[PDB]
DNA sequence: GGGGGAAGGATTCC
DNA sequence: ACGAATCCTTCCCCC
């Protein structure tokens, strides 16, 4: 009977910049995402507690970060470097199990059902791993432990930052009971506002509702997931997830609408994009446009054969042309996205 | 009806 | 105000 270990790295990006210059440690760090529209324009990717302490988190404008903390250290995002770093740490969890699911860049799940016998021995294996990474890589994590991936993640969510927490089989009930419902994975404000109205505040509130309204309300899938979870019967296993799509979406230097000028940003997007594909040939391709007021439209197309960079360019025009058509608005951003690899 | 499946908007979250 | 996997919904051609 199953025990899942979820490991998340504390303020990952921000921490990689600290690991690479401890002269930053103890200071408020903000990894920012620029664009080139107006000096210090962009958004916040992540920020260590010092800055996160005073409300500076992700997706929030770079100015609002300064107006709050003018003396904070701001650094552009640098995936490349962060990717290497992670992979290594991710190659170290692979030493603890073959039943491993790498969900993101900062987190993975382990099925230690056959390495440890219980929560003291598992939570034992926890501390061991927090140290085996804190010493070899200079990166602290947070470990969550319960019976299904869903609850493991949650465990760790609480016990943060830098911490290990386990939710025995008893607390699952304390939580299918007490745990708010919007503090659940896959339940962003949209769906929560829905549940609100549905007169649902906790996991259990679903258990007492005519499914069919829950279906049309949130969408059968979420509907079955919430139910199956509230009935201590949720249990999808740890599966190695495969990259299913790739794509870049750069931000133009100024809201536009004539084809010619728009074109180049897009070719750069397909350019970088392709470098990232590497050895991977896709059969699909979309063109994503972010209108002037931040809405979205994207046209696509699938081929019976794998796309070539030379073909990628042609289609990424008939699709931009198709977009610049029925949608009139001015175009703010734009970019390409390749799916359906061969 | 119902399957196979492609298109595009929506929704969560790193 | 800055990538992706899943989910849903319509649209569709052919058995
Ligand atoms: N570009 C961008 N990056 C984000 C956003 N949200 C999160 N990230 C990135 C920054 C983090 O280094 C990486 C992992 O995010 P986490 O939610 O696990 O937080 P982080 O690792 O920063 O520390 P945390 O666990 O949140 O205390 O995801 C976002 O909205 N935009
Ligand atoms: Mg993290
Ligand atoms: Mg939520
Ligand atoms: Mg996370």
Residue-by-residue DSSP string for A37-93: SSSS-EEEEEE-HHHHTTT--TTS-HHHHHHH-TTSEEEE--HHHHHHHHHHHHHHH
Experimental method: X-ray
Q: How far apart are CA A225 and CA A261, in angstroms?
A: 46
Q: How far apart are CA A163 and CA A165, in angstroms?
A: 7
How far, in Å, is the CA of A318 from the C1' of nucleotide C14?
29
Q: Does the Cβ of A50 fall within 6 Å of ligand 1? A: no
Encoding tokens for residue A171?
């607390």
Q: Is A8 annotated as a binding residue?
A: yes
Peptide bond into A291 cis (omega under 30): no
Smallest CA-to-CA distance from A297 within A324, A317, A315 is with A324
* Residue A40: partners with Cβ closer than 8 Å, 6 or more residues away: A34, A62, A63, A66, A74
Of all ligands present, the nearest one to the C-alpha of A30 is: 1
- Residue with structure tokens 């401890």? A22
Q: Which resolution, in Å, applies to this structure?
A: 3.1
∠ Cα A281 A341 A313 (to 5°):
55
* Residue A333: partners with Cβ closer than 8 Å, 6 or more residues away: A249, A250, A251, A252, A289, A290
How many angstroms separate the Cα of A297 from the Cα of each of A18, A224, A244? 38, 29, 21
Going from N- to C-terminal start, the domains of chain A cover 3-11+79-167, 12-78, 168-234, 245-337
How many angstroms separate the Cα of A146 from the Cα of each of A124, A149, A219? 14, 7, 27
CATH topology of domain A168-234: DNA polymerase; domain 1 (1.10.150)
**Contact call for residues A58 and A46 (beta carbons, < 8 A):** yes
Mutate to test the pocket of ligand 1, among A6, A16, A58, A74 (most ligand atoms within 8 A of CB): A58
Complete DSSP assignment for A163-179: EEEE--HHHHHHHHHSS
Q: Does the Cβ of A106 fall within 6 Å of ligand 1? A: yes
Q: Does the Cβ of A341 fall within 6 Å of ligand 1? A: no
Please tell me whether residue A291 adopts helix, strand or coil conformation: strand
Q: Is the CB of A66 under 7 A from strand B?
A: no
CATH assignment of A245-337? 3.30.1490.100
Please tell me whether residue A342 adopts helix, strand or coil conformation: coil
Q: Does the Cβ of A157 fall within 6 Å of ligand 1? A: no
CATH superfamily of domain region A3-11+79-167 = Reverse transcriptase/Diguanylate cyclase domain (3.30.70.270)
Q: How far apart are CA A20 and CA A4, in angstroms?
A: 31
Class of domain A12-78: alpha beta
Nearest residue (CA) to ligand 1, atom 26 = A11
**Contact call for residues A335 and A319 (beta carbons, < 8 A):** no
| Strand order across the beta sheet in which A100-101 lies | A100-101, A107-111, A4-9, A141-146, A163-166
Smallest CA-to-CA distance from A73 within A55, A49, A47 is with A47
**Which element (helix H / strand E) includes A19?**
helix A12-19
Mutate to test the pocket of ligand 1, among A17, A46, A82, A103 (most ligand atoms within 8 A of CB): A46
Smallest CA-to-CA distance from A331 within A304, A299, A295, A279 is with A295
Going from the Cα of A157 to the center of ligand 4, the distance in angstroms, rounded, reads: 8
Encoding tokens for residue A188?
């962003």
Q: How far apart are CA A15 and CA A134, in angstroms?
A: 12
Residue A107 a catalytic site member: yes
Q: Is the CB of A65 under 7 A from strand B?
A: no
**Contact call for residues A214 and A223 (beta carbons, < 8 A):** yes
Q: How far apart are CA A225 and CA A231, in angstroms?
A: 10
Same fold, A12-78 and A168-234: no
What's the CA dihedral at A168, A126, A30, A337 to 10 degrees?
-80
| Strand order across the beta sheet in which A245-256 lies | A245-256, A331-339, A284-291, A296-302
Smallest CA-to-CA distance from A277 within A240, A300, A304, A245 is with A245
Dihedral sign from CA coordinates of A217, A156, A76, A65: positive
| Other beta carbons less than 10 A from residue A86's beta carbon | 22
Q: Is A114 annotated as a binding residue?
A: no
């Amino acid at each position: 009977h199953m025990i899942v270990l979820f490991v998340d790295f504390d303020y990952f990006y921000a921490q990689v910049e600290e690991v690479l210059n401890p002269s930053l440690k103890g200071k408020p760090v903000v990894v920012c995402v620029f664009s080139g529209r107006f000096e210090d324009s962009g958004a916040v990717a992540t920020a260590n507690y010092e800055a996160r302490k005073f409300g500076v988190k992700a997706g929030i404008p770079i100015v609002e970060a300064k107006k709050i903390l003018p003396n904070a250290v701001y650094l552009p995002m640098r995936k490349e470097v962060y990717q290497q770093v992670s992979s290594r740490i991710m190659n170290l969890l692979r030493e603890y199990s073959e039943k491993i699911e790498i969900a993101s860049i900062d987190e993975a799940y382990l099925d230690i059902s056959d390495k440890v016998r219980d929560y003291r021995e598992a939570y034992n294996l926890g501390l061991e791993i927090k140290n085996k990474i804190l010493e070899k890589e200079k990166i602290t994590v947070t470990v969550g432990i319960s019976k299904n991936k869903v609850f493991a993640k949650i465990a760790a969510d609480m016990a943060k930052p830098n911490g290990i927490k386990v939710i025995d089989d008893e607390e699952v009930k304390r939580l299918i009971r007490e745990l708010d419902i919007a503090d659940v994975p896959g339940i962003g404000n949209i769906t929560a506002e829905k549940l609100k109205k549905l007169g649902i505040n906790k996991l259990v509130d679903t258990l007492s509702i005519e499914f069919d309204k829950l279906k049309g309300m949130i969408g059968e899938a979420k509907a079955k997931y919430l139910i199956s979870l509230a009935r201590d019967e949720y249990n999808e296993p740890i599966r190695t997830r495969v990259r299913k799509s790739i794509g870049r979406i750069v931000t133009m230097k100024r809201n536009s609408r004539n084809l010619e000028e728009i074109k180049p940003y897009l070719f750069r997007a397909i350019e970088e994009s392709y470098y990232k594909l590497d050895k991977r040939i896709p059969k699909a391709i979309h063109v994503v446009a972010v209108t002037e007021d931040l809405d979205i439209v994207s046209r696509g197309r699938t081929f019976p054969h794998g796309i070539s960079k030379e073909t990628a360019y042609s289609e990424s025009v008939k699709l931009l042309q198709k977009i610049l058509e029925e949608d009139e608005r001015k175009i703010r951003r734009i970019g390409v996205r390749f799916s359906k690899f061969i």
